[PDB]
Design a protein around this ligand. Structure first.
Ligand SMILES: [Cu+2]
Ligand SMILES: [Cu+2]
Ligand SMILES: [Cu+2]
Ligand SMILES: [Cu+2]
Ligand SMILES: [Cu+2]
Ligand SMILES: [Cu+2]
Lengths: 345, 345, 345
């Protein structure tokens, strides 16, 4: 007997986001989304390591859902008969029944329809959580995404000023636990079930083998770099359903950062590095001031450079020599420079 | 020559809390507490693994002490002659002498009386800290608790509105470092001293074998679930004296969260997951809106499900279908559903 | 064509800081700094373990640079011909070209001059970042420091009150990854290049062998303790370029803490323990109220006591028995004390 208008949303693969309004004058709606569970082998690194992944909608992360405060979110969760395990969904945005997990457990060949009222603003994790040890294993197998619940008036700076983004990207970070053989090579498996025992042993020691954005090392570099232009205000939503992260935009800042990810809280200003606690989503606005390549990392630089957790932005525009300039290009060290007379010698 | 009234406090075992007022019109008092050190073997997991524990008042965590701003806290620390090691106490709430550690070192058969003025509001860790390597070892052996210093006016939302809790629970999280034999079995020892060398080796690699609430895996599940009712505002104090945590109430939120734990700072609103930095206590208020089981975890879900760090709430009340409802129970996937035509196939 | 006055800054070795003003009436200047890369073997622990370090200005951390909002910072980066590797510098305070890394890559025998406008207030990390796996390896080899960009009006409490420090100390925390032989002994190498392969293997498992302040275990204890006096307001700048930390002043508090480190954000008040996300600098003011030894730690107490991460303050002044006093010195436990009748027995 919820007599509200219904609006179907077509989800898009991360790091892109389905079309939505920021500020709206539309009243509350039943926002209809479909998530289809896909268990499949995926490539996770640049050497071609494969992985028995479990996904919402075939991606790591699952897609970003966007609704407004006071909307109702009606999610059809589908578990195709080609899958081997039960699945469900827990929305950190939702109230009751373990986030909906206690209402969405489906076997292969089943679907279920959950509605939750979007009473809490912010970016939130959603993840599979079937029970017991299956909870971490489904989540670190890739079954996690995020949902953004925007204020109807859109974002503000917590000091009565509207904030509008020109562009939005969703960065889902995934810790992966890939078994190795005696020789230190990553092991391949024919099913998630066959990988489980060896994978739980790696999981137990809490140290990922891979930490990736958008499902694989290099996913958001080279050809798949994130585009932007000088002057654009870009919202960067970052989620980590299992493990902490410390995002940093190399050559940039977080102009406005909700590191705990909830828009009822004023953002922090001018951050270098922020913190996404495992089990949450956060968000950072930045207005690009300079063109060129930016690397977006977790600033555990070992994770960023050696375990997969670097994305790139390619920003078009004119260089601003006032903000930064190379005064003198690399040149031989004079004489007659008196390095040798310095304090620390 | 402190001529204030004296009030003796009877401590209770966590996760319960001794009777106290929130707002008070009482003036500053000397609040008298007794903590008795108990070294003893304890069971820490559901397979019956034992552990040479060191405790305040026989529990992990030690009990929650509750006082008001400007009270004086007079702690009798007792180290019974049946114990084998010196102990002391460091109050993160206190000013001077390493939190009182430099004034409370006692051998077995000794007691000492420390007074500290409650000048700082919030929830704080207290822990043993005898010196050198004994500091981490006493703390990760279980010698840590918390103290709450309430404003005399009780809690507020940082925006001039009173916040009152119906119910308070203290969740002490403990990282444990249990040696394993060649075969991967947990080792048993006859004394804390005999366990030390092997335990320090595990401690050095920074990866707990167990992460538990109230001293053991399963301590706050099944029969020992935390009770609440729909409409109750519940304060959840969480401490971790050694290692970070990211609390999350599955199916709930943090309405008001002091993740750094200090009531001179406005809480954040509507959090999904918060962050307890090792060496601190934090606190979250939540008003239950839905009945049923809630799991309260660290949202490193590997820690939560596989290393012990899950508690349950059992909440009585009437389900609210407006906040969340199962629109359609699990059913076979139509035909004629066109899964196969979806974008990500 | 930047026609501003030029001011040369003489850097000093951490934990000291070069002379500067807090509030200034000086207009924007070109602030000239020189950083000289020094690759050298350094001692990192109390057992004399050596390490193939890479440094700015021969120290871990590199020195603290201090400027004011709207200054321009003109950095001459020097890579002497006695070094073996290329180096560069990334300023988290700077906008564009990967923080300046994309404008400062120099071979041994070269120098380069970078200018960046100090548009963002706070404490920021600077670090070497040559590209790819060399980024973490240069950073965890010691090539990181910090820069403080003060408001021209100096610090404030975010509530319109000026905050002034009597004394400033820069604590650079360094995670180190030292290979071990079959026997568990730390390995020595003749060059950074020869250490690389074995070091990357340790780095990959994300668990430091050492966590140190000012480059070595014990660097800021005993003779090299940090001095202060009762009544002094001390600013403690803490940086970690690669890995999280949770600073705590044992026997003290953070009166005013910018844990994300950016002065456009009001500090938090009265913290026990704060959080420095890897890849950032934060800062805490404290007014000493009590004399004596204070230990300043990361409150992973295993790291603090067993991997090197403890500093000391030695504070001169008169003890305040009102804040804390030993009511009764250690004494035998009465009879007739009824320990045995207590709840937890
Ligand atoms: Cu699943
Ligand atoms: Cu969750
Ligand atoms: Cu002890
Ligand atoms: Cu402590
Ligand atoms: Cu370098
Ligand atoms: Cu960086």
């Amino acid at each position: 007997d919820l007599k509200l208008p219904r609006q179907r949303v077509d989800l898009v693969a991360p790091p892109f986001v389905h079309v939505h309004e920021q500020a709206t004058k539309q009243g509350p709606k039943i926002m209809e989304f479909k998530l289809v569970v896909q268990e499949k082998k995926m490539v996770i690194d640049e050497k071609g390591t494969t992985f028995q992944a479990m996904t919402f909608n075939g991606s790591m992360p699952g897609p970003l859902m966007v609704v407004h405060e006071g909307d109702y979110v009606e999610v059809t969760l589908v578990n195709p008969a080609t899958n081997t395990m039960p699945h469900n969904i827990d929305f950190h945005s939702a109230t009751g029944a373990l986030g909906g997990g206690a209402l969405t457990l489906i076997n292969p060949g089943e679907q279920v329809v959950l509605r939750w009222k979007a009473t809490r603003t912010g970016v939130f994790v959603y993840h599979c959580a079937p029970g017991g040890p299956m909870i971490p294993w489904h989540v670190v197998s890739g079954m996690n995404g995020a949902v953004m619940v925007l204020p109807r008036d859109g974002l503000n700076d917590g000091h009565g000023h509207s904030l509008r983004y020109d562009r939005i990207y969703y960065i889902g970070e995934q810790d992966l636990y890939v078994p190795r053989d005696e020789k230190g090579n990553f092991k391949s498996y024919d099913s998630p079930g066959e990988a489980y025992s060896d994978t739980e042993e790696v999981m137990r020691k809490l140290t990922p083998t891979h930490v990736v954005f958008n499902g694989k090392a290099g996913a958001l570099t080279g050809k798949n770099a994130l585009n932007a232009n000088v002057g654009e205000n870009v919202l960067i939503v970052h989620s980590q359903a299992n493990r902490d992260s410390r995002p940093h935009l190399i050559g940039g800042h977080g102009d406005y950062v909700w590191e705990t990810g909830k828009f009822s809280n004023a953002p922090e200003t001018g951050l270098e590095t922020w913190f996404i606690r495992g089990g949450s989503a956060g968000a950072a606005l930045y207005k690009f001031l300079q063109p060129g390549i930016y690397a977006y990392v977790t600033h555990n630089l070992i994770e960023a450079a050696n375990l997969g957790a670097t994305a790139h932005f390619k920003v078009e525009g004119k260089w601003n020599d006032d903000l930064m300039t190379q005064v003198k290009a690399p040149a031989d060290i004079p004489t007659g420079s008196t390095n040798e007379n310095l304090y620390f010698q």
